[PDB]
């Protein structure tokens, strides 16, 4: 009643914890690929920036 | 009922309402009888009184009696010992949950919680069982997915999951069927569909033969013929 309404709310909180945990891990997985792309891209950009700098 | 079962030797079809009142009644006079209160104030003779009632109802060498006993489960706490004791003693449980009523589904029968041991792959044969096994899994998955859908939404879900969700919603509203006695309480003509026909109609749905049919064209209508007809109605 109190006990059950607490308990269901606590179960909800547990499920929320689980989802946020899961999400955090998947986010890390995605993050590695994201970083990999950004290096290669940034290198390419830097070559163009080389013109803009030298051109002043 | 005994007179019918035994002496007239006929079949019967007992109906009792509401058996929580039977428990409750015994509980009230328990105090007066001076018996020390048992759990949640119930009579200490709760078990044996239930037992006498339940045992009296049976299918003997003579008659056969089909009881349908209503039970009122206070605040839907089936854990409550009086409902729980009755839950054991009854052969073919059906749970009708408030939520399902609120979903607008009439029957209010909660499919997950309604369970009867009469369902078997021998009793109703392999096809019936297998079809129902697919239904059970589909719904249970859908329930599991509710948490994901709640925060994340339809995002992390697979294509397979999306089809399962769509099927579950279709099944959820395919179950919805109007009652003849709710041509007054809902004013929709009642629909009774024969069992073989229902198995077939559900089989088709699961195969996805009618997953091109709108979700609301499964809602509160009978058989596949009706579902298709309501699809035509919505189409028009």
Short mmCIF file of N, CA and C in Angstrom, two decimals, chain B residues 42-221:
data_model
loop_
_atom_site.label_atom_id
_atom_site.label_comp_id
_atom_site.label_asym_id
_atom_site.label_seq_id
_atom_site.Cartn_x
_atom_site.Cartn_y
_atom_site.Cartn_z
N UNK B 42 -8.52 -12.19 8.70
CA UNK B 42 -9.39 -13.22 8.17
C UNK B 42 -9.63 -14.28 9.20
N UNK B 43 -10.69 -15.09 9.00
CA UNK B 43 -11.07 -16.15 9.90
C UNK B 43 -9.98 -17.19 9.94
N UNK B 44 -9.64 -17.85 11.04
CA UNK B 44 -8.57 -18.83 11.06
C UNK B 44 -9.03 -20.08 10.37
N UNK B 45 -10.33 -20.17 10.07
CA UNK B 45 -10.94 -21.34 9.51
C UNK B 45 -11.10 -21.05 8.05
N UNK B 46 -10.33 -20.08 7.51
CA UNK B 46 -10.45 -19.60 6.16
C UNK B 46 -10.22 -20.71 5.20
N UNK B 47 -9.15 -21.49 5.43
CA UNK B 47 -8.78 -22.53 4.52
C UNK B 47 -9.82 -23.59 4.43
N UNK B 48 -10.28 -24.10 5.59
CA UNK B 48 -11.19 -25.21 5.61
C UNK B 48 -12.56 -24.86 5.12
N UNK B 49 -13.02 -23.62 5.37
CA UNK B 49 -14.29 -23.17 4.85
C UNK B 49 -14.29 -23.06 3.36
N UNK B 50 -13.17 -22.56 2.79
CA UNK B 50 -13.01 -22.45 1.36
C UNK B 50 -13.03 -23.83 0.79
N UNK B 51 -12.34 -24.75 1.48
CA UNK B 51 -12.16 -26.11 1.07
C UNK B 51 -13.46 -26.83 1.00
N UNK B 52 -14.36 -26.63 1.98
CA UNK B 52 -15.64 -27.27 1.95
C UNK B 52 -16.46 -26.82 0.79
N UNK B 53 -16.44 -25.51 0.47
CA UNK B 53 -17.18 -25.02 -0.66
C UNK B 53 -16.65 -25.56 -1.94
N UNK B 54 -15.32 -25.49 -2.12
CA UNK B 54 -14.71 -25.84 -3.36
C UNK B 54 -14.82 -27.30 -3.62
N UNK B 55 -14.60 -28.13 -2.59
CA UNK B 55 -14.67 -29.56 -2.67
C UNK B 55 -16.04 -30.05 -2.99
N UNK B 56 -17.08 -29.37 -2.46
CA UNK B 56 -18.45 -29.72 -2.74
C UNK B 56 -18.74 -29.61 -4.21
N UNK B 57 -18.14 -28.62 -4.90
CA UNK B 57 -18.32 -28.45 -6.31
C UNK B 57 -17.33 -29.37 -6.97
N UNK B 58 -17.79 -30.39 -7.73
CA UNK B 58 -16.89 -31.27 -8.42
C UNK B 58 -17.72 -32.05 -9.41
N UNK B 59 -17.03 -32.83 -10.28
CA UNK B 59 -17.63 -33.66 -11.28
C UNK B 59 -17.39 -35.05 -10.78
N UNK B 60 -18.48 -35.72 -10.37
CA UNK B 60 -18.47 -37.03 -9.77
C UNK B 60 -18.71 -38.01 -10.88
N UNK B 61 -18.85 -39.32 -10.53
CA UNK B 61 -19.24 -40.37 -11.44
C UNK B 61 -20.62 -40.05 -11.97
N UNK B 62 -21.48 -39.49 -11.08
CA UNK B 62 -22.76 -38.94 -11.41
C UNK B 62 -22.57 -37.65 -12.15
N UNK B 63 -23.15 -36.54 -11.66
CA UNK B 63 -23.21 -35.30 -12.38
C UNK B 63 -21.90 -34.63 -12.60
N UNK B 64 -22.00 -33.43 -13.18
CA UNK B 64 -20.89 -32.62 -13.55
C UNK B 64 -21.46 -31.26 -13.36
N UNK B 65 -20.65 -30.36 -12.79
CA UNK B 65 -21.10 -29.06 -12.38
C UNK B 65 -20.01 -28.17 -12.82
N UNK B 66 -20.37 -27.08 -13.52
CA UNK B 66 -19.39 -26.15 -14.00
C UNK B 66 -19.61 -24.90 -13.22
N UNK B 67 -18.75 -24.61 -12.22
CA UNK B 67 -18.92 -23.42 -11.43
C UNK B 67 -18.20 -22.34 -12.16
N UNK B 68 -18.74 -21.11 -12.10
CA UNK B 68 -18.03 -19.94 -12.51
C UNK B 68 -18.16 -19.10 -11.29
N UNK B 69 -17.05 -18.78 -10.60
CA UNK B 69 -17.14 -18.10 -9.34
C UNK B 69 -16.43 -16.80 -9.52
N UNK B 70 -17.16 -15.69 -9.27
CA UNK B 70 -16.62 -14.35 -9.26
C UNK B 70 -15.85 -14.16 -8.00
N UNK B 71 -14.78 -13.34 -8.04
CA UNK B 71 -13.98 -13.09 -6.87
C UNK B 71 -13.67 -11.64 -7.01
N UNK B 72 -13.63 -10.92 -5.87
CA UNK B 72 -13.45 -9.50 -5.80
C UNK B 72 -12.17 -9.53 -5.07
N UNK B 73 -11.20 -8.78 -5.58
CA UNK B 73 -9.86 -8.88 -5.12
C UNK B 73 -9.66 -7.50 -4.62
N UNK B 74 -9.52 -7.24 -3.32
CA UNK B 74 -9.52 -5.88 -2.84
C UNK B 74 -8.32 -5.16 -3.35
N UNK B 75 -8.54 -4.00 -4.00
CA UNK B 75 -7.52 -3.13 -4.54
C UNK B 75 -6.57 -3.85 -5.45
N UNK B 76 -7.06 -4.90 -6.16
CA UNK B 76 -6.30 -5.77 -7.04
C UNK B 76 -5.07 -6.32 -6.36
N UNK B 77 -5.19 -6.75 -5.09
CA UNK B 77 -4.09 -7.36 -4.41
C UNK B 77 -4.48 -8.78 -4.32
N UNK B 78 -3.88 -9.59 -5.22
CA UNK B 78 -4.24 -10.98 -5.38
C UNK B 78 -3.43 -11.71 -4.35
N UNK B 79 -2.35 -11.04 -3.89
CA UNK B 79 -1.52 -11.39 -2.78
C UNK B 79 -2.34 -11.53 -1.54
N UNK B 80 -3.37 -10.67 -1.32
CA UNK B 80 -4.32 -10.77 -0.22
C UNK B 80 -4.74 -12.19 0.02
N UNK B 81 -4.61 -12.76 1.23
CA UNK B 81 -4.66 -14.20 1.41
C UNK B 81 -5.95 -14.80 1.00
N UNK B 82 -7.07 -14.08 1.19
CA UNK B 82 -8.34 -14.59 0.80
C UNK B 82 -8.43 -14.77 -0.69
N UNK B 83 -8.03 -13.84 -1.55
CA UNK B 83 -7.98 -14.13 -2.96
C UNK B 83 -6.97 -15.18 -3.28
N UNK B 84 -5.80 -15.19 -2.62
CA UNK B 84 -4.78 -16.13 -2.96
C UNK B 84 -5.19 -17.55 -2.69
N UNK B 85 -5.93 -17.80 -1.59
CA UNK B 85 -6.41 -19.13 -1.28
C UNK B 85 -7.39 -19.58 -2.30
N UNK B 86 -8.27 -18.67 -2.75
CA UNK B 86 -9.24 -19.03 -3.76
C UNK B 86 -8.55 -19.28 -5.07
N UNK B 87 -7.42 -18.58 -5.33
CA UNK B 87 -6.71 -18.65 -6.58
C UNK B 87 -6.21 -20.03 -6.81
N UNK B 88 -5.78 -20.70 -5.72
CA UNK B 88 -5.31 -22.04 -5.81
C UNK B 88 -6.44 -22.98 -6.06
N UNK B 89 -7.54 -22.82 -5.30
CA UNK B 89 -8.58 -23.81 -5.32
C UNK B 89 -9.35 -23.87 -6.62
N UNK B 90 -9.23 -22.85 -7.50
CA UNK B 90 -10.03 -22.80 -8.71
C UNK B 90 -9.21 -23.34 -9.83
N UNK B 91 -9.87 -24.20 -10.64
CA UNK B 91 -9.31 -24.90 -11.77
C UNK B 91 -8.83 -24.05 -12.90
N UNK B 92 -9.60 -23.03 -13.33
CA UNK B 92 -9.31 -22.34 -14.57
C UNK B 92 -9.39 -20.87 -14.34
N UNK B 93 -8.29 -20.28 -13.83
CA UNK B 93 -8.23 -18.89 -13.46
C UNK B 93 -8.29 -17.99 -14.68
N UNK B 94 -8.87 -16.80 -14.50
CA UNK B 94 -8.97 -15.78 -15.49
C UNK B 94 -8.81 -14.58 -14.64
N UNK B 95 -7.94 -13.64 -15.07
CA UNK B 95 -7.75 -12.42 -14.34
C UNK B 95 -8.18 -11.35 -15.28
N UNK B 96 -9.00 -10.41 -14.76
CA UNK B 96 -9.54 -9.30 -15.48
C UNK B 96 -8.98 -8.13 -14.76
N UNK B 97 -8.05 -7.38 -15.39
CA UNK B 97 -7.37 -6.29 -14.74
C UNK B 97 -7.96 -4.99 -15.18
N UNK B 98 -7.87 -3.99 -14.27
CA UNK B 98 -8.41 -2.66 -14.39
C UNK B 98 -7.82 -1.95 -15.57
N UNK B 99 -6.51 -2.17 -15.80
CA UNK B 99 -5.72 -1.49 -16.79
C UNK B 99 -6.32 -1.74 -18.14
N UNK B 100 -6.66 -3.01 -18.42
CA UNK B 100 -7.18 -3.47 -19.69
C UNK B 100 -8.52 -2.85 -19.98
N UNK B 101 -9.32 -2.61 -18.91
CA UNK B 101 -10.60 -1.94 -18.99
C UNK B 101 -10.38 -0.53 -19.44
N UNK B 102 -9.36 0.12 -18.84
CA UNK B 102 -8.97 1.49 -19.06
C UNK B 102 -8.44 1.67 -20.45
N UNK B 103 -7.75 0.65 -21.01
CA UNK B 103 -7.28 0.66 -22.38
C UNK B 103 -8.44 0.68 -23.33
N UNK B 104 -9.65 0.36 -22.82
CA UNK B 104 -10.89 0.45 -23.54
C UNK B 104 -11.22 -0.90 -24.05
N UNK B 105 -10.45 -1.91 -23.61
CA UNK B 105 -10.62 -3.23 -24.11
C UNK B 105 -11.61 -3.84 -23.17
N UNK B 106 -12.68 -4.39 -23.77
CA UNK B 106 -13.79 -4.99 -23.10
C UNK B 106 -13.88 -6.19 -24.00
N UNK B 107 -13.46 -7.42 -23.69
CA UNK B 107 -13.12 -7.97 -22.38
C UNK B 107 -12.08 -7.21 -21.61
N UNK B 108 -12.18 -7.21 -20.27
CA UNK B 108 -11.19 -6.61 -19.41
C UNK B 108 -10.17 -7.64 -19.01
N UNK B 109 -10.23 -8.84 -19.63
CA UNK B 109 -9.39 -9.97 -19.34
C UNK B 109 -7.99 -9.59 -19.68
N UNK B 110 -7.07 -9.72 -18.71
CA UNK B 110 -5.68 -9.41 -18.89
C UNK B 110 -5.11 -10.68 -19.45
N UNK B 111 -4.55 -10.72 -20.65
CA UNK B 111 -4.26 -11.97 -21.31
C UNK B 111 -3.09 -12.62 -20.65
N UNK B 112 -2.10 -11.81 -20.22
CA UNK B 112 -0.92 -12.29 -19.57
C UNK B 112 -1.24 -13.00 -18.29
N UNK B 113 -2.17 -12.42 -17.49
CA UNK B 113 -2.44 -12.95 -16.18
C UNK B 113 -3.49 -14.02 -16.21
N UNK B 114 -4.34 -14.08 -17.27
CA UNK B 114 -5.32 -15.12 -17.36
C UNK B 114 -4.59 -16.34 -17.83
N UNK B 115 -4.71 -17.45 -17.08
CA UNK B 115 -3.94 -18.62 -17.37
C UNK B 115 -4.79 -19.73 -16.93
N UNK B 116 -4.85 -20.80 -17.74
CA UNK B 116 -5.69 -21.92 -17.46
C UNK B 116 -4.87 -23.07 -17.89
N UNK B 117 -4.90 -24.16 -17.11
CA UNK B 117 -4.04 -25.29 -17.33
C UNK B 117 -4.74 -26.25 -18.24
N UNK B 118 -5.90 -25.82 -18.78
CA UNK B 118 -6.70 -26.57 -19.68
C UNK B 118 -6.10 -26.39 -21.05
N UNK B 119 -5.32 -25.30 -21.24
CA UNK B 119 -4.60 -25.03 -22.45
C UNK B 119 -3.44 -25.98 -22.49
N UNK B 120 -3.37 -26.82 -23.55
CA UNK B 120 -2.31 -27.78 -23.73
C UNK B 120 -2.29 -28.06 -25.20
N UNK B 121 -1.18 -28.67 -25.67
CA UNK B 121 -0.96 -28.91 -27.06
C UNK B 121 -1.55 -30.23 -27.41
N UNK B 122 -2.23 -30.87 -26.44
CA UNK B 122 -2.89 -32.11 -26.62
C UNK B 122 -4.33 -31.80 -26.48
N UNK B 123 -4.70 -31.04 -25.42
CA UNK B 123 -6.08 -30.76 -25.11
C UNK B 123 -6.72 -29.98 -26.22
N UNK B 124 -6.02 -28.94 -26.73
CA UNK B 124 -6.55 -28.15 -27.81
C UNK B 124 -5.65 -28.32 -29.00
N UNK B 125 -4.77 -29.33 -28.96
CA UNK B 125 -3.98 -29.69 -30.10
C UNK B 125 -2.87 -28.73 -30.36
N UNK B 126 -1.93 -29.20 -31.20
CA UNK B 126 -0.67 -28.57 -31.42
C UNK B 126 -0.86 -27.22 -32.03
N UNK B 127 -1.79 -27.09 -33.01
CA UNK B 127 -1.98 -25.83 -33.66
C UNK B 127 -2.46 -24.78 -32.73
N UNK B 128 -3.46 -25.12 -31.88
CA UNK B 128 -4.06 -24.15 -31.00
C UNK B 128 -3.02 -23.66 -30.05
N UNK B 129 -2.22 -24.62 -29.53
CA UNK B 129 -1.22 -24.36 -28.55
C UNK B 129 -0.16 -23.49 -29.11
N UNK B 130 0.31 -23.79 -30.33
CA UNK B 130 1.42 -23.12 -30.93
C UNK B 130 1.03 -21.71 -31.23
N UNK B 131 -0.22 -21.51 -31.71
CA UNK B 131 -0.74 -20.21 -32.04
C UNK B 131 -0.74 -19.37 -30.80
N UNK B 132 -1.21 -19.97 -29.70
CA UNK B 132 -1.31 -19.29 -28.44
C UNK B 132 0.03 -19.03 -27.84
N UNK B 133 1.02 -19.91 -28.10
CA UNK B 133 2.36 -19.71 -27.64
C UNK B 133 2.95 -18.52 -28.31
N UNK B 134 2.69 -18.35 -29.62
CA UNK B 134 3.16 -17.19 -30.32
C UNK B 134 2.54 -15.94 -29.78
N UNK B 135 1.24 -15.98 -29.43
CA UNK B 135 0.55 -14.84 -28.88
C UNK B 135 1.17 -14.44 -27.58
N UNK B 136 1.47 -15.43 -26.72
CA UNK B 136 1.94 -15.18 -25.40
C UNK B 136 3.27 -14.51 -25.43
N UNK B 137 4.16 -15.01 -26.29
CA UNK B 137 5.47 -14.44 -26.46
C UNK B 137 5.39 -13.04 -26.97
N UNK B 138 4.50 -12.79 -27.95
CA UNK B 138 4.40 -11.51 -28.60
C UNK B 138 4.02 -10.45 -27.62
N UNK B 139 3.01 -10.75 -26.78
CA UNK B 139 2.54 -9.84 -25.78
C UNK B 139 3.55 -9.60 -24.71
N UNK B 140 4.27 -10.65 -24.28
CA UNK B 140 5.22 -10.53 -23.20
C UNK B 140 6.38 -9.68 -23.61
N UNK B 141 6.77 -9.79 -24.89
CA UNK B 141 7.79 -8.97 -25.48
C UNK B 141 7.35 -7.55 -25.47
N UNK B 142 6.07 -7.30 -25.82
CA UNK B 142 5.51 -5.99 -25.95
C UNK B 142 5.55 -5.27 -24.63
N UNK B 143 5.26 -6.01 -23.54
CA UNK B 143 5.29 -5.53 -22.19
C UNK B 143 6.68 -5.17 -21.78
N UNK B 144 7.66 -6.01 -22.15
CA UNK B 144 9.06 -5.78 -21.88
C UNK B 144 9.51 -4.52 -22.57
N UNK B 145 9.05 -4.32 -23.82
CA UNK B 145 9.44 -3.20 -24.63
C UNK B 145 8.81 -1.93 -24.16
N UNK B 146 7.79 -1.97 -23.28
CA UNK B 146 7.12 -0.77 -22.83
C UNK B 146 8.06 0.16 -22.12
N UNK B 147 9.00 -0.38 -21.31
CA UNK B 147 9.99 0.42 -20.62
C UNK B 147 10.91 1.16 -21.56
N UNK B 148 11.37 0.49 -22.63
CA UNK B 148 12.23 1.08 -23.62
C UNK B 148 11.52 2.17 -24.36
N UNK B 149 10.25 1.92 -24.74
CA UNK B 149 9.42 2.82 -25.49
C UNK B 149 9.15 4.04 -24.66
N UNK B 150 9.06 3.87 -23.32
CA UNK B 150 8.75 4.93 -22.40
C UNK B 150 9.75 6.04 -22.42
N UNK B 151 11.07 5.74 -22.43
CA UNK B 151 12.04 6.79 -22.34
C UNK B 151 12.58 6.97 -23.72
N UNK B 152 13.21 5.91 -24.26
CA UNK B 152 13.88 5.91 -25.54
C UNK B 152 12.95 6.10 -26.70
N UNK B 153 11.74 5.48 -26.68
CA UNK B 153 10.80 5.57 -27.78
C UNK B 153 11.16 4.51 -28.76
N UNK B 154 10.70 4.66 -30.02
CA UNK B 154 10.96 3.70 -31.06
C UNK B 154 12.22 4.18 -31.73
N UNK B 155 13.38 3.64 -31.30
CA UNK B 155 14.65 4.20 -31.67
C UNK B 155 15.62 3.05 -31.68
N UNK B 156 15.91 2.48 -30.49
CA UNK B 156 16.86 1.40 -30.32
C UNK B 156 16.28 0.10 -30.82
N UNK B 157 14.94 0.09 -31.03
CA UNK B 157 14.16 -1.02 -31.52
C UNK B 157 14.58 -1.44 -32.89
N UNK B 158 14.51 -2.77 -33.12
CA UNK B 158 14.90 -3.42 -34.34
C UNK B 158 13.69 -3.30 -35.24
N UNK B 159 13.85 -3.65 -36.53
CA UNK B 159 12.77 -3.77 -37.48
C UNK B 159 11.83 -4.86 -37.05
N UNK B 160 12.42 -5.97 -36.54
CA UNK B 160 11.70 -7.12 -36.04
C UNK B 160 10.86 -6.71 -34.88
N UNK B 161 11.45 -5.88 -33.97
CA UNK B 161 10.77 -5.40 -32.79
C UNK B 161 9.61 -4.54 -33.18
N UNK B 162 9.78 -3.69 -34.21
CA UNK B 162 8.75 -2.81 -34.68
C UNK B 162 7.57 -3.55 -35.24
N UNK B 163 7.82 -4.66 -35.96
CA UNK B 163 6.78 -5.51 -36.46
C UNK B 163 6.06 -6.20 -35.34
N UNK B 164 6.80 -6.64 -34.31
CA UNK B 164 6.25 -7.26 -33.12
C UNK B 164 5.37 -6.31 -32.35
N UNK B 165 5.79 -5.03 -32.21
CA UNK B 165 5.03 -3.99 -31.55
C UNK B 165 3.75 -3.74 -32.28
N UNK B 166 3.83 -3.68 -33.63
CA UNK B 166 2.68 -3.44 -34.46
C UNK B 166 1.70 -4.56 -34.38
N UNK B 167 2.20 -5.81 -34.40
CA UNK B 167 1.38 -6.98 -34.22
C UNK B 167 0.73 -7.03 -32.88
N UNK B 168 1.45 -6.65 -31.81
CA UNK B 168 0.94 -6.69 -30.47
C UNK B 168 -0.19 -5.75 -30.26
N UNK B 169 -0.10 -4.53 -30.82
CA UNK B 169 -1.16 -3.58 -30.82
C UNK B 169 -2.36 -4.04 -31.58
N UNK B 170 -2.13 -4.72 -32.72
CA UNK B 170 -3.20 -5.29 -33.50
C UNK B 170 -3.90 -6.40 -32.79
N UNK B 171 -3.14 -7.31 -32.14
CA UNK B 171 -3.65 -8.40 -31.35
C UNK B 171 -4.37 -7.87 -30.16
N UNK B 172 -3.84 -6.80 -29.54
CA UNK B 172 -4.39 -6.20 -28.36
C UNK B 172 -5.77 -5.72 -28.64
N UNK B 173 -5.99 -5.18 -29.85
CA UNK B 173 -7.26 -4.64 -30.19
C UNK B 173 -8.04 -5.63 -30.99
N UNK B 174 -7.48 -6.82 -31.30
CA UNK B 174 -8.20 -7.85 -32.01
C UNK B 174 -8.96 -8.63 -30.98
N UNK B 175 -8.42 -8.71 -29.75
CA UNK B 175 -9.04 -9.37 -28.63
C UNK B 175 -10.34 -8.71 -28.27
N UNK B 176 -10.38 -7.35 -28.37
CA UNK B 176 -11.53 -6.53 -28.11
C UNK B 176 -12.69 -6.97 -28.97
N UNK B 177 -13.81 -7.34 -28.33
CA UNK B 177 -14.93 -7.91 -29.01
C UNK B 177 -16.11 -7.46 -28.20
N UNK B 178 -17.23 -7.06 -28.77
CA UNK B 178 -18.35 -6.56 -27.99
C UNK B 178 -19.16 -7.71 -27.48
N UNK B 179 -19.81 -7.50 -26.31
CA UNK B 179 -20.57 -8.51 -25.64
C UNK B 179 -21.99 -8.20 -25.95
N UNK B 180 -22.84 -9.25 -25.95
CA UNK B 180 -24.25 -9.16 -26.26
C UNK B 180 -24.97 -8.38 -25.20
N UNK B 181 -24.45 -8.45 -23.96
CA UNK B 181 -25.02 -7.81 -22.80
C UNK B 181 -24.42 -6.44 -22.65
N UNK B 182 -23.66 -5.99 -23.67
CA UNK B 182 -23.09 -4.68 -23.72
C UNK B 182 -23.54 -4.12 -25.03
N UNK B 183 -24.79 -4.48 -25.38
CA UNK B 183 -25.59 -3.78 -26.35
C UNK B 183 -26.38 -2.77 -25.58
N UNK B 184 -26.12 -2.64 -24.26
CA UNK B 184 -26.78 -1.72 -23.40
C UNK B 184 -25.69 -0.91 -22.77
N UNK B 185 -24.59 -1.57 -22.35
CA UNK B 185 -23.53 -0.90 -21.64
C UNK B 185 -22.51 -0.33 -22.58
N UNK B 186 -22.67 -0.55 -23.91
CA UNK B 186 -21.76 0.02 -24.87
C UNK B 186 -22.59 0.28 -26.11
N UNK B 187 -23.71 -0.45 -26.30
CA UNK B 187 -24.59 -0.22 -27.41
C UNK B 187 -24.03 -0.67 -28.73
N UNK B 188 -23.18 -1.71 -28.72
CA UNK B 188 -22.54 -2.20 -29.91
C UNK B 188 -23.05 -3.61 -30.02
N UNK B 189 -23.56 -4.09 -31.16
CA UNK B 189 -24.07 -5.45 -31.32
C UNK B 189 -23.05 -6.50 -30.93
N UNK B 190 -23.42 -7.46 -30.05
CA UNK B 190 -22.51 -8.46 -29.53
C UNK B 190 -22.05 -9.37 -30.62
N UNK B 191 -20.88 -10.01 -30.44
CA UNK B 191 -20.30 -10.83 -31.47
C UNK B 191 -19.73 -12.02 -30.76
N UNK B 192 -20.07 -13.23 -31.25
CA UNK B 192 -19.63 -14.48 -30.70
C UNK B 192 -19.08 -15.19 -31.88
N UNK B 193 -17.82 -15.66 -31.79
CA UNK B 193 -17.13 -16.24 -32.91
C UNK B 193 -16.71 -17.59 -32.42
N UNK B 194 -17.00 -18.65 -33.21
CA UNK B 194 -16.73 -20.02 -32.88
C UNK B 194 -15.25 -20.23 -32.73
N UNK B 195 -14.86 -21.20 -31.89
CA UNK B 195 -13.50 -21.40 -31.48
C UNK B 195 -12.59 -21.71 -32.63
N UNK B 196 -12.99 -22.61 -33.56
CA UNK B 196 -12.15 -23.06 -34.66
C UNK B 196 -11.84 -21.87 -35.52
N UNK B 197 -12.88 -21.03 -35.74
CA UNK B 197 -12.81 -19.85 -36.53
C UNK B 197 -11.88 -18.84 -35.92
N UNK B 198 -11.90 -18.70 -34.58
CA UNK B 198 -11.01 -17.79 -33.89
C UNK B 198 -9.58 -18.22 -34.02
N UNK B 199 -9.27 -19.53 -33.95
CA UNK B 199 -7.92 -20.04 -34.03
C UNK B 199 -7.37 -19.72 -35.38
N UNK B 200 -8.21 -19.92 -36.42
CA UNK B 200 -7.86 -19.67 -37.78
C UNK B 200 -7.60 -18.21 -37.99
N UNK B 201 -8.48 -17.36 -37.43
CA UNK B 201 -8.41 -15.95 -37.64
C UNK B 201 -7.20 -15.38 -36.98
N UNK B 202 -6.86 -15.87 -35.78
CA UNK B 202 -5.68 -15.46 -35.08
C UNK B 202 -4.45 -15.96 -35.78
N UNK B 203 -4.52 -17.15 -36.42
CA UNK B 203 -3.38 -17.74 -37.08
C UNK B 203 -2.94 -16.86 -38.21
N UNK B 204 -3.92 -16.32 -38.96
CA UNK B 204 -3.70 -15.49 -40.11
C UNK B 204 -2.95 -14.24 -39.74
N UNK B 205 -3.38 -13.61 -38.62
CA UNK B 205 -2.85 -12.37 -38.09
C UNK B 205 -1.40 -12.54 -37.75
N UNK B 206 -1.05 -13.66 -37.09
CA UNK B 206 0.27 -13.95 -36.60
C UNK B 206 1.19 -14.15 -37.76
N UNK B 207 0.68 -14.78 -38.84
CA UNK B 207 1.43 -14.98 -40.05
C UNK B 207 1.66 -13.66 -40.75
N UNK B 208 0.83 -12.65 -40.43
CA UNK B 208 1.00 -11.30 -40.87
C UNK B 208 0.25 -11.10 -42.14
N UNK B 209 -0.76 -11.98 -42.38
CA UNK B 209 -1.57 -11.96 -43.57
C UNK B 209 -2.48 -10.78 -43.57
N UNK B 210 -2.63 -10.12 -42.41
CA UNK B 210 -3.50 -9.00 -42.27
C UNK B 210 -2.77 -7.96 -41.49
N UNK B 211 -1.44 -7.82 -41.69
CA UNK B 211 -0.68 -6.77 -41.03
C UNK B 211 -0.67 -5.55 -41.89
N UNK B 212 -1.42 -5.57 -43.00
CA UNK B 212 -1.61 -4.43 -43.85
C UNK B 212 -2.89 -3.76 -43.44
N UNK B 213 -3.60 -4.32 -42.43
CA UNK B 213 -4.87 -3.83 -41.96
C UNK B 213 -4.61 -2.83 -40.85
N UNK B 214 -5.25 -1.65 -40.79
CA UNK B 214 -5.05 -0.65 -39.74
C UNK B 214 -5.34 -1.18 -38.36
N UNK B 215 -4.68 -0.61 -37.33
CA UNK B 215 -4.78 -1.06 -35.96
C UNK B 215 -6.19 -0.94 -35.43
N UNK B 216 -6.86 0.18 -35.78
CA UNK B 216 -8.21 0.48 -35.36
C UNK B 216 -9.22 -0.34 -36.11
N UNK B 217 -8.81 -1.06 -37.19
CA UNK B 217 -9.71 -1.94 -37.89
C UNK B 217 -9.69 -3.31 -37.30
N UNK B 218 -8.91 -3.51 -36.21
CA UNK B 218 -9.01 -4.69 -35.40
C UNK B 218 -9.87 -4.40 -34.22
N UNK B 219 -9.91 -3.12 -33.79
CA UNK B 219 -10.60 -2.67 -32.60
C UNK B 219 -12.07 -3.00 -32.56
N UNK B 220 -12.50 -3.53 -31.40
CA UNK B 220 -13.85 -3.82 -30.95
C UNK B 220 -14.73 -4.40 -32.03
N UNK B 221 -14.20 -5.39 -32.77
CA UNK B 221 -14.98 -6.10 -33.75
C UNK B 221 -14.61 -7.52 -33.58
#
